[PDB]
Amino acid sequence: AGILAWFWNERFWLPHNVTWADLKNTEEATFPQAEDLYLAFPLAFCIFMVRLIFERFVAKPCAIALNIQANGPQIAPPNAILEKVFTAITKHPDEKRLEGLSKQLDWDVRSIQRWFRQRRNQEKPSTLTRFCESMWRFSFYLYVFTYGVRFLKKTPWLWNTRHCWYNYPYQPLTTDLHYYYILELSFYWSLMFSQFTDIKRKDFGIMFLHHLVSIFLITFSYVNNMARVGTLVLCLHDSADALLEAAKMANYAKFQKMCDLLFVMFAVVFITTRLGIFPLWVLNTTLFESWEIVGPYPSWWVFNLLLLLVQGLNCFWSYLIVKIACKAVSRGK
Amino acid sequence: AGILAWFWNERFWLPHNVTWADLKNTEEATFPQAEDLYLAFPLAFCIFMVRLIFERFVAKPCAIALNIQANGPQIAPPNAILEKVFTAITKHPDEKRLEGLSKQLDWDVRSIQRWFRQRRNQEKPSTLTRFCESMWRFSFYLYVFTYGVRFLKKTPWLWNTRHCWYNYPYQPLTTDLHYYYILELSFYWSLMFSQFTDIKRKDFGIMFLHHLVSIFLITFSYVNNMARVGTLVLCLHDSADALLEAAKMANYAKFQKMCDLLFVMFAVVFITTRLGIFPLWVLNTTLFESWEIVGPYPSWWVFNLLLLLVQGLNCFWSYLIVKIACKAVSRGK
Amino acid sequence: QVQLVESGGGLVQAEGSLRLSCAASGRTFRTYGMGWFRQAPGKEREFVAALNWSGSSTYYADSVKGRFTISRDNAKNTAYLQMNSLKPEDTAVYYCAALRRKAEYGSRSIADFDSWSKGTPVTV
Amino acid sequence: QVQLVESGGGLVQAEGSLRLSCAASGRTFRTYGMGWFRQAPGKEREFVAALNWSGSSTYYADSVKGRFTISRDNAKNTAYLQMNSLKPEDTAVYYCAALRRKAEYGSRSIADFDSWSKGTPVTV
Ligand SMILES: CCCCCCCCCCCCCCCC(=O)N[C@@H](C)[C@@H](O)C[C@H](O)CCCC[C@@H](O)C[C@H](C)C[C@H](OC(=O)C[C@@H](CC(=O)O)C(=O)O)[C@H](OC(=O)C[C@@H](CC(=O)O)C(=O)O)[C@H](C)CCCC
Ligand SMILES: CCCCCCCCCCCCCCCC(=O)N[C@@H](C)[C@@H](O)C[C@H](O)CCCC[C@@H](O)C[C@H](C)C[C@H](OC(=O)C[C@@H](CC(=O)O)C(=O)O)[C@H](OC(=O)C[C@@H](CC(=O)O)C(=O)O)[C@H](C)CCCC
Ligand SMILES: *[C@@H]1O[C@H](CO)[C@@H](O)[C@H](O)[C@H]1NC(C)=O
Ligand SMILES: *[C@@H]1O[C@H](CO)[C@@H](O)[C@H](O)[C@H]1NC(C)=O
């Protein structure tokens, strides 16, 4: 209990002269509590259960009726040198490596690229399972974005972001905020469950770090009662995730034109909402307005550093997205 | 909220003239609350995480140093008729089926039995993973049984079971009871996680039903403040589970004599503590003493029916255990 | 957390009958177990009888067993102690108390009863 | 959940200066935003000035902007309103109130302020 009391120092999180005892629930108003986050763990499991049903009785018949092959990817032709290079050298050879392999094996570069793509597909799961997972993600993201838009349409701090900090932290918790935060955290914990235990042959990369950062931000902004700006960030980030899954579903259905159009639109929305609106609208209120309304307290630095890390990760993702979308634009012409 | 209020009817669970409002936490005493069970869900996940570490850095080197083969089971010889029978007819053929297959294929019955055993092992996971899982289960069960014995050694209701019902439900909750119940429920939820998502190629059979019954009993006895008899049941049932895992570990280490001795001792303990002590000690206090001290209320019937179901499942398990142990006794002579 | 007021005391003849009552001023009387104690001239306090919240389980002392019967009424928020065939050794002051939510049933110690009362004198 | 008592009222000369004070009897004065209201003969109540719990953000009315400054001291559990260059239109009764924990900042309505006060009369 000593270590927990040291971690939850009231002079670190809350502003000056504000104590946790002032945020206790009474009959006058209710405030967010850390214990309310425990409920995110059972519901997450329930969500996972529902996901299985969605992949069993709903997404699978739709994929079958879409002429999606239920078997595994086509087996790449055997090659000792190619297999050794793939296992040891790299999985995505560069132009120089491809030229060297072509010269060594007296084979066309296109054949080597096709073999590498086939090997990568063989390592990756089957197409139908990915289609079902993308369908589930698309449905959830569409519902969450719609709910977030409907909820923020009436809130007073959407139009004037300074209302996020005027009465902070003495801002009562409503049912809509609680439901929104619990739903988001439950979905992220469901993703963590599907990543850790469902199949441990998956990859821990940048996406895993981004998920960890998102979970940390949601948890410690709900605990600290920074939910008004959290909802803005959540809606802004979930705006562009409803088109990526649709583009993936179109790609897995062998619809070239539809997938290209959907991905171009997704890239436009992603760039607009995570490089032009985020730093001028969300990073404005959490850096400048918060400084002049609330004041400098230690948790401000931590949260702003995490937001800058999120901005950097979004820059990296946007770079990859535009690099891929240039090929789609070229093909569309 | 209406359906929850209908489910938690106070005239159904609690005895007559007792309401939930009388069991609210005050400064005088604390009582078990349903919300305290939510904490069982995060900790369970944490337990699962620890399990992976135990299977990665502790159990695996011990298995390797024990000359346990890390590869898969030996491949059964190909046979179209045998494969068709295994996939369609059955996986455990009887004496008549074995004789018919031997006559049809002109092969010895021992060869057919060996082929069926090899096929079953091929379907089952590798030996090393099972050894690691058994080691983890053995460690946890040993710790839990030791803690339960140490805790019940000083309680007043172990020696006189009528103290489970004298002041029911106005019995305060202590730290030890809370820790014991949370630990047990967390372990069972960890098992449910490892069963559902870790690998869905597993089997849903009698063990799954037994786990569901155990989770239901623990949850709804903690909520209803029937924890004093719950601890007795938990300790009695965890007494015999610390030897089964040791017997399994000895079996996977190719130690015939040690495995036979451990399984004989486990069978003795299992029969003694789940057919002679359980119905005369636990079913006595939950049927007769509870009737004459507390009285007849609707939840009494539900809990006693569940206890009778547990007794039946234990009878089935004991039947299988003794049928297997007869072979070990015969071999030991 | 209950205020207990006693009544029914007085002088009685040898081998008589008496009925002490202990009323509670509160709505939580039905969640505590009642008990009675004896204070004779000299010596110290002694345990007489007690029962749990529902009144199903009742236990007395060895010297008073078979003559004293203690019951309770949760509808009227009160407890009763009927004494039959009194003896001169019963002349003492009777106190009414309740178990303090943490003492186990069967307690016969002063420290296990919290909400005391003024008490009534009974002479035989 | 705070009791507010006002002081500093009285008669002042034209284009003078005054300083009204509103003291709170409670430890929760620092978690509510203070505000002031005006009651002139006839018409109805009007909004004068208000500020949030920390005193960082402060907003007045259009007619009184530039002359009245409202601040607060959480150490002494009180709020102050300094009025400079008073006008005959300022002769009215001043009331001290607090935001009711659910009204958003910038509210200028009577229903948004709960803990009222007796008020003080100011004549110019
Ligand atoms: C005072 C202070 C107060 C402070 C208060 C603070 C409050 C805080 C409050 C809480 C705030 C919470 C915020 C949460 C934010 C949040 O939410 N973040 C994440 C959780 C998350 O939102 C990120 C998102 O998600 C990234 C998305 C990337 C997307 C990209 O990554 C897509 C590639 C670049 C491309 C695709 O890439 C994949 O899909 C890769 C997959 C594929 C598969 O499934 O098999 C894989 O390999 O793994 C794929 O590209 C290809 O297929 C191209 C390839 C191959 C080809 O041709 O086909 C090629 O050409 O090379 C194409 C979509 C296919 C169609 C192309 C036309
Ligand atoms: C007013 C009212 C108030 C009311 C208040 C109420 C309060 C309630 C408050 C909470 C109360 C909570 C209670 C909770 C109880 C609880 O806790 N229950 C369960 C969760 C649980 O406790 C059950 C336990 O657990 C069963 C155990 C069976 C064990 C058996 O099942 C073992 C076989 C029969 C045998 C083994 O069987 C296996 O191990 C099978 C596995 C093996 C594998 O892993 O691969 C498999 O196939 O699946 C295996 O047998 C073989 O190997 C024999 C075979 C093959 C051969 O030769 O080798 C053969 O011969 O045919 C041997 C152990 C090997 C060594 C033999 C010498
Ligand atoms: C905080 O309290 C200190 C002393 O109690 C005081 O000097 C300071 O002005 C206060 N600050 C705020 C914003 O209330
Ligand atoms: C329960 O209450 C009813 C009426 O209030 C009463 O008749 C009955 O005796 C009570 N029973 C118990 C055990 O308190």
Residue numbers in the entry:
A (entry chain A), B (entry chain C): 2 to 334
C (entry chain D), D (entry chain B): 1 to 124
What does the paper say about this structure?
Ceramides and dihydroceramides are synthesized by six ceramide synthase (CerS) enzymes, each with specificity for different acyl-CoA substrates. Ceramide with a 16-carbon acyl chain (C16 ceramide) has been implicated in obesity, insulin resistance and liver disease and the C16 ceramide-synthesizing CerS6 is regarded as an attractive drug target for obesity-associated disease. Here we report cryo-electron microscopy structures of human CerS6, capturing covalent intermediate and product-bound states. These structures, along with biochemical characterization, reveal that CerS catalysis proceeds through a ping-pong reaction mechanism involving a covalent acyl–enzyme intermediate.
